Design a protein around this ligand. Structure first.
Ligand SMILES: O=C(O)[C@@H](O)c1cccc(Oc2ccccc2)c1
Ligand SMILES: O=C(O)[C@@H](O)c1cccc(Oc2ccccc2)c1
Ligand SMILES: O=C(O)[C@@H](O)c1cccc(Oc2ccccc2)c1
Ligand SMILES: O=C(O)[C@@H](O)c1cccc(Oc2ccccc2)c1
Lengths: 157, 157, 156, 156, 157, 157
């Protein structure tokens, strides 16, 4: 009955994201990972690549599935009969910005947002910083799942 | 069967707290509001008074129950077969202190914490500020459940 | 006794959050000037932005609306004033605006007064309102009634 | 035209950071009242705190100093005003003061204007100044000249 | 020639503090850990106990020594012919508060302060939170050095 | 032999930067100021111009040298036999973003970062804001080294 959506661009998914997925899947009957695509800007990975990397690293979460979308997150959530979003947060700065979006989403669609504190070990990994570090040759193998790391290096080379 | 604990002193419960209770009860199969008994610093209302005020304000939430608790919160949570805490947050500063507690609770007992952003209208209400304003004659009736407000005036006489 | 402040912004479009700040500034200063930045890529033209603000502030007799360019402190000083009034939502806002406020005081002796957002508008911004409306979300409760139909026009 | 604001605090003692805020408030409002809280454990008596502020604000003709108790908004409204002016150093400050500002607006319609600290006084507070002086640190550059000798008196 | 002081109450020292000590000892010729004592409030551990717990967990840092003091930190620093303080920081909130003290210390004595970001794993441990959790029976064995944990449990029992 | 790298674009160097350089040079045996060459986004001054402005402003710092750098900062640092970065901080928000970078740099290369709080007088100056103010005729001469100011006026004509 209960369910939540875990949104992001996941370009690529990180171990921080996977931690959030696992924690959501432990507390809700179903979890949908929403891979939100900007039809106007391509990321590093195509939609099918992003989804494949997430599926490979969530194979042991039976109540989680992965779907892409675009436009308003609250429409994605509501069209699946749900009304909760779960998002990871690292800092107070994160909270202030995400707060605005959560209150807007509640206002326009009645959708609630639950935030979870990042695991300490992954508090400094982000998709953007991992890509930037890897671009200039830094070692990010411990911050990304196996389903991501060598595909990332491949994209960069 | 999903579930979460909503902990606090609730001295007294505010409309901000109630908003959190409602949103938790909408997303989890069971919610337990845990009312802290604090041996040292006593407050304005007894634990039984606080429990009754919450029960009156949550009468329409059939999957929410109210209980007193003492000591280590994660013991309270695990003793009831649960492993999630739900708390409301108002500010970035709130997030930083609560994040420390959440990471500590996950480390020592595997209990997770979900945070929800305050409804905008209650971003500035707290039990402590409401009591202080009311003590000096300010009108806080729009910030508290109807019953709380009547009981609060009683304690002040 | 010739008190006055300037309320600056791009106002693309003006929101109820902005209007709340204008009203509060107008209640505490003899003269308020809303300064609409010309910074030519926005949704509305500078003239359209000025009109929407004038429409929404008709009940504020001591407020006027003017366009401006360049250093804000020059705009303020050339009108004989030396105060800016700005609304703030978060501590993050305060830290960024703090830098600009201290710079403005340093270079021109112009002071900045910040006012806390009304709770109901803590989450509205011109940018988020435009984004939500663009994908069909209802923002009518967040914008002046006039602005709202004008926005519908730009999209449809 | 009857503009006015109240600058509240314990001022135990008043610092150059506070005085900077008083001066800036006095420059932008016709009338400024400094409200000195009676909250009986401080270092100086309410009378002493009032005297130190009056001594330091002699060049501010439109400022007066009064003691107060209870709800700040009652102090403000009973003097016919509905604005508070408060200085702010950090984003953390803003978040805490934001709650009080929104509460005060809610219960009494009293607005709050915040001003950014002068950079030179970003680190001074009554409490830190007292603490440092107590252990022999030189805080003379952080306090009004009058206050400084008075502080030396309380310690020696 | 170069040197820094690492101050705190260290009541007790945590793994977060030890991380800071090690990082300071790697970058300065000498490091002094300053155990600052409030002569008006006893902590959990006496001064000699605090120093002993720090020495036992820093035995492999040859350029580090431990001394107690009270009063102005900048006097402790200057009387040893030094003029740098090194302190760990976890959050932006920490930085704002410590910033005030660092600027005051520079103002009154010319002493500089260098801050270092906490290691991610210890970002949620503090002496106060470890004591509080342990008081109510929570497991904090992974957050404190061996020189501390059982002595803490002993104090509590 | 202790040492640290002070990295940045310094376009142009401000009195805030110089304060950081001075404080680093006072506490480390060697300081290297690393001036970023950025292939994409160019700025107002060439790398050689930026280096010369820093050299003129740091003429009294014999243990500080200035060099251009590109790519991964921790490679620059380790290539010079060092493993410390020193950066100035103005705000809590600054700390949060820089903390992510510092933890990342420590993770991928074992390079540590020490932060110093801005002198109060320069808390509001930045290269970007100084240029913007100067472009429209504002006087920023009290915020920049004397030589920078002369060169800045030249670029604006
Ligand atoms: O008012 C507050 O928020 C705090 O006092 C607080 C924090 C965390 C939990 C709390 O309540 C309980 C703790 C342990 C067992 C049961 C309940 C109260
Ligand atoms: O929307 C905002 O807040 C910013 O874009 C901003 C900041 C400061 C001033 C602004 O408007 C003016 C600038 C210069 C002259 C006149 C007006 C706009
Ligand atoms: O020092 C401070 O900032 C606080 O102690 C503070 C906050 C708000 C008002 C204060 O002073 C008054 C309160 C009530 C009536 C009159 C004055 C003091
Ligand atoms: O202006 C800034 O602060 C950033 O652009 C920045 C951040 C970190 C390092 C930077 O400089 C270097 C990076 C790599 C090698 C050499 C120098 C610049």
């Amino acid at each position: 009955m209960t369910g939540a959506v875990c949104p992001g661009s996941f370009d690529p998914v990180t171990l921080g994201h996977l931690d959030v997925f696992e924690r959501a899947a432990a507390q809700f009957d179903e979890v949908i990972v929403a891979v939100l695509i900007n039809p106007n800007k391509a990321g590093m990975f195509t939609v099918d690549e992003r989804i494949e990397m997430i599926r490979e690293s969530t194979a042991d979460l039976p109540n989680l599935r992965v779907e892409s979308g675009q436009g308003l997150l609250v429409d994605f959530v509501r069209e699946r009969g749900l009304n909760a979003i779960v998002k990871g947060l690292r800092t107070g700065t994160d909270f202030e910005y995400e707060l605005q979006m959560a209150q807007m989403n509640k206002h326009i669609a009645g959708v609630d947002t639950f935030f979870v504190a990042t695991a300490p070990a992954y508090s400094f990994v982000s998709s953007s910083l991992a890509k930037e570090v890897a671009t200039y040759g830094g070692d990010v193998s411990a911050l990304l799942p196996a389903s991501v790391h060598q595909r990332l290096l491949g994209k960069l080379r």
